[PDB]
Symmetry: none
Subunit: 359 residues, 2 copies
């Protein structure tokens, strides 16, 4: 069976790496605004609907191609999404919009066992993102994999708090604390990236794009074999792999700025919680999507080999003192699109079995 992955660290064998090509700035709408730092609002305000700076995209393409080269060198089989023009404007009976990109396979596909799951998504500009990955998915399907599509939302106004009070990150973070997010519980929605796998236990978080109905759908769909737990963090930010990236059996990277409220569950489990050192990325480099914390958004080739940013020396040193071989790759420009290694990939096959690490 080509598809088989139970966690984030077993020996990687096959992976899907995204594409920076024809990426479009999403129209500046409520759920987009709730996910971007003030600094960039005018960019989305003016640039919305057009491609991301073509000069910048060209540098991303180059960086990702090298990443793919190294992956092949490391013995990993690389598959890529199809080239597609995300500038096309589509219209459903509920809304009209243009696309985003097929850069982050982690945002939309998650693999549990022999099953590949397409996430519903929660952004209008990402409604038809799955189109970019259907060729790969049908191929695995013909080859034996189980294939699932979570219920695609309508994404009607009813799913969004049209009056979500975000005017700064300080408004979002307080509301978040209050349990207030731009998405309602009108219908199931979620980004696969708010789920991180550890064998029989998957951990998820309610976020701007993943609501509780989304989490219960997953919980209800994978049970009894898999337990989906909900954990929360201080100053929550969507996509868990940049706040709590699990890198080994009982070893996790906990972002110092976003401490987990349930850290004790893991302390009691005899888990090693590592706090990575601060990122060194220049504040002048643009990250239209995400935060500087992409430095901890690492991809493990196995327990002892990590693919880390070539520029983040401090975190490189940490892995090394720990006995983990750093495979330095530079993707500074690819980061602007909103993600690091874990985000730009989706592990389709890892050599290993299903186990419990929470005891």
């Amino acid at each position: 069976c080509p598809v088989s992955s139970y966690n984030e660290w077993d020996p990687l064998e096959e992976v899907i790496v995204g594409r920076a090509e024809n990426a479009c700035v999403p129209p500046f709408t409520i759920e987009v605004k709730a996910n971007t730092y003030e600094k960039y609002w005018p960019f989305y305000q003016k640039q919305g609907g057009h491609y991301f700076p073509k000069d910048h995209l060209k540098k991303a393409v180059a960086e990702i191609e090298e990443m793919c080269n190294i992956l092949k060198t490391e013995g990993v089989t690389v598959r890529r999404p199809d080239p597609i023009d995300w500038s096309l404007k589509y219209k459903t009976p509920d809304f009209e919009s243009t696309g985003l990109y097929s850069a982050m396979p982690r945002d939309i596909l998650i693999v549990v066992g022999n099953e590949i799951i397409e996430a519903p998504m929660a952004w209008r500009s990402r409604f038809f993102e799955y189109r970019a990955y259907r060729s790969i998915i049908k191929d695995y399907f013909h080859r034996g994999a189980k294939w699932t599509t979570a219920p695609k939302p309508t994404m009607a106004d009813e799913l969004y708090n049209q009056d979500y009070p975000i005017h700064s990150v300080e408004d979002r973070h307080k509301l978040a604390a209050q349990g207030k997010f731009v998405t309602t519980e009108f219908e199931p929605c979620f980004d696969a990236a708010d789920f991180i796998r550890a064998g029989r236990d998957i951990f998820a978080q309610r976020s701007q794009v993943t609501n509780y109905l989304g989490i219960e759908w997953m919980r209800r769909h994978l049970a009894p074999d898999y337990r989906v737990h909900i954990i929360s963090f201080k100053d929550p930010n969507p996509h868990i792999d940049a706040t709590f990236n699990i890198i080994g059996p009982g070893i996790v990277l906990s972002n110092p700025d976003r401490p987990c409220h349930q850290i004790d569950l893991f302390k009691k489990a005899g888990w090693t919680i590592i706090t990575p050192p601060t990122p060194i990325i220049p504040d002048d480099h643009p990250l239209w999507m995400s935060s500087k914390w992409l430095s901890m958004n690492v991809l493990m080739l196995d327990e002892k080999r990590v693919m880390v940013d070539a520029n983040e020396v401090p975190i490189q040193k940490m892995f090394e003192k720990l006995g983990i071989t750093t495979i330095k790759v530079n993707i500074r420009n690819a980061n602007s699109l909103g993600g690091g290694f874990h985000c730009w990939t989706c592990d389709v096959r890892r050599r290993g079995t299903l186990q419990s690490y929470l005891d």
Copy 2:
């Protein structure tokens, strides 16, 4: 000044608690063999160079984290050594070896006044243990503390009796009596744990890992302000805090199986010598390092508060009849690594002054 501790009982304020992570079985060499009970020789023989049972380490981590929680609850500031992979094989011009762990800060750091002292050590597998604690030490240094490193040994064959006749604990104990230990006086070596502080008088013992040159170095380095005395016990075992743990001004816990030859010096001083009751730890529980006497290896939070093993009821009752509040913590699995509370910690700051308790 962050660093300030003159004895083992003044109100604890800051402490360093070790780590069970990535601990490695030391290669079965002469000085290791001289410190282990026959029962475990085949474990070291086969397991040497690999990690201690990962399932067991996971339980230790959990137990130590709770200990840290309680310490924080008791108002003690906790610092921890850095995560490091002790499986790395290093090579000096005299020998080659893998590491052990940074579990016992007491084995390597001792605080006298405002000075923090790194012990030389005497095991090849512990040559580079100091690496785990340098971040903390440099921090205290920048903050005003005095920092000292005793002369690091070469640990050439010349330091060890390649033919030390140990074949059983009955051979070691007789030789010990004869003044025969696995270490020679080729060069200074010692474990800080063979020193127990009582204000102006520090007591030490010649042991498998602490030779007379080691003791004279300390004696000569701390004089005139501090007097380092050498005491001896029946059936000596390295690390004095499990044979003669000083718990208060003139109150000491004397292991019934290892009576002190100089007990009269203390009787004459008007000191209270308490003989703890026998341990109740199961003989089936593995203690790769140490003896069951870890039960008396207590850590005093102050004169009236002791952190004692949650399972050793008999010794708990003793402290209680004495008016000392027991703070029960369970570290049954952490004990296997070779130590109790006093061993898993190193008091950096205690509220008090330098005094004489020997009159």
